[PDB]
Design a protein around this ligand. Structure first.
Ligand SMILES: O=C(O)c1cc(-c2ccc(Cl)cc2)cc(NS(=O)(=O)c2ccc(-c3ccccc3)cc2)c1C(=O)O
Ligand SMILES: O=C(O)c1cc(-c2ccc(Cl)cc2)cc(NS(=O)(=O)c2ccc(-c3ccccc3)cc2)c1C(=O)O
Ligand SMILES: [Cl-]
Lengths: 237, 233
């Protein structure tokens, strides 16, 4: 096909091990998540993949995944572009809570609604939230407008602020012939995949992208996939 | 009072820093990596914050930057890579140790190259083991036939570093952006020479330390207001 696009979802983070909602909280990779990134990079290296430009979020679990991949494929020299628009979904007031704390505070019914809903956000992260200054006052978001800095996000909100970056910054690079690598997060990558495949809300909500595994798209000149997404890695994985 | 920080990478693999590593893309040794860790160490102890980072396209400088960004929890900063901050290109000498260099070219000529601002070493030719490795490397494929060196005098190195400083770095400093530069001995020499208005003799005697943050305080004209300071103990 005319173009080739590679996606990679970061692996396990330190807060995944505590089953805590991270969202915009800047949790690092766990040792196992770092090893996942190494295996994905090895897979790209074995398959001879070459890139011209890389995009990632401003969160270290995705950035470190990208670094590890670039090291594995000996392409540390590539230009890298970081954007808040590829950040993980913002989980609002759930940020920092674990599974038990979330169920205890909100109840089965409410949490079920948040799980399955496309456009119902979780509660807002208010100024007295333990992570409010950690996230909302981080200087990396200093340049965001008031309406851009979320206090919480539904999946629809996340996709809505990721796709502008796709359309305005990534698509031109692809049509320029650049081989793009995107290292990001489950829900921002969901945004890109929904756009690429024209998926419904129900379908995207059921899509669970594997972690640490290069996801390969073969795209025609209008960026329409010519075949299903392919996963890279030894036969078992 | 603008604040500018430079860091020179440390030791590279296989003793290549004592072997004219030049444009060969040598990685850091474990010890050079530890040096970068100590430098980032010191920058975080001092509470330094940056807004934009510049580095070469050589992995020993890039990995030094990565290690620093990791130590100071600023992995999210924008990073700009450019061949114009690469190490001096040592031409045919690249990869030779001092004894092999003297054996092949003679003590007299080597002393001349050592001392001269504007005399390059011999070019890297196809029989050199790094020739295709460097000159056909994809990362330089957009360079024009005049931009891609086969060899460089120190004059050449500084001449192709300063256009990047002037066109890309200076505007950032003038907007108040706090700049970090992770690069190499001779490309950093170019910057230090332009900053301090040093002579050719003086710049050839300047040996910047490795792995140690180098702090400049600049006025509204980007002239230093005091000598460079090192960060640590
Ligand atoms: O022992 C049972 O009777 C039982 C109980 C529950 C249950 C009990 C109390 C609460 Cl507060 C929430 C759920 C869940 C069960 N399994 S579940 O339906 O698939 C299911 C699993 C998980 C969640 C959930 C909700 C919010 C945060 C995280 C997880 C929701 C539903 C079973 C069961 O049948 O084993
Ligand atoms: O992987 C996932 O898709 C997942 C997502 C969420 C989540 C996501 C976003 C928000 Cl805003 C809030 C929550 C939470 C999760 N764990 S759970 O809270 O305990 C939990 C367990 C079971 C149910 C449920 C619902 C309806 C019918 C039967 C069972 C609901 C919740 C999980 C998960 O891993 O199962
Ligand atoms: Cl980077």
């Amino acid at each position: 096909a005319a173009y080739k696009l590679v996606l990679i979802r970061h692996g396990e983070s330190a807060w995944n091990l505590e089953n805590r909602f991270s969202g915009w909280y800047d949790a690092d990779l766990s040792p196992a998540g770092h090893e996942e990134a190494k295996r994905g990079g090895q897979a790209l290296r074995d398959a001879g993949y070459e890139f011209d430009i890389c995009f990632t979020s401003v969160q270290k679990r995705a950035i470190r995944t990208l670094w590890t991949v670039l090291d594995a494929i000996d392409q540390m020299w590539l230009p890298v572009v970081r954007t808040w628009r590829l950040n993980e979904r913002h989980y609002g007031g759930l940020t920092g809570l674990n599974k038990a704390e979330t169920a205890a505070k909100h109840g089965e019914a409410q949490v079920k609604i948040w799980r399955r809903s496309y456009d119902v956000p979780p509660p807002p992260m208010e100024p007295d939230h333990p992570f409010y200054s950690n996230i909302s006052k981080d200087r990396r978001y200093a340049d965001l407008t008031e309406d851009q800095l979320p206090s919480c996000e539904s999946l629809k909100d996340t996709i809505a602020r990721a796709l502008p970056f796709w359309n305005e910054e990534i698509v031109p690079q692809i049509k320029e012939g650049k081989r793009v690598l995107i290292a990001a997060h489950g829900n921002s990558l969901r945004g890109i995949v929904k756009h690429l495949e024209g998926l419904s809300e129900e379908a995207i909500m059921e899509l669970n992208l594997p972690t640490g595994i290069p996801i390969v798209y073969e795209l025609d000149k209008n960026l329409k996939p010519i075949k299903p997404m392919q996963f890279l890695g030894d036969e078992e994985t």
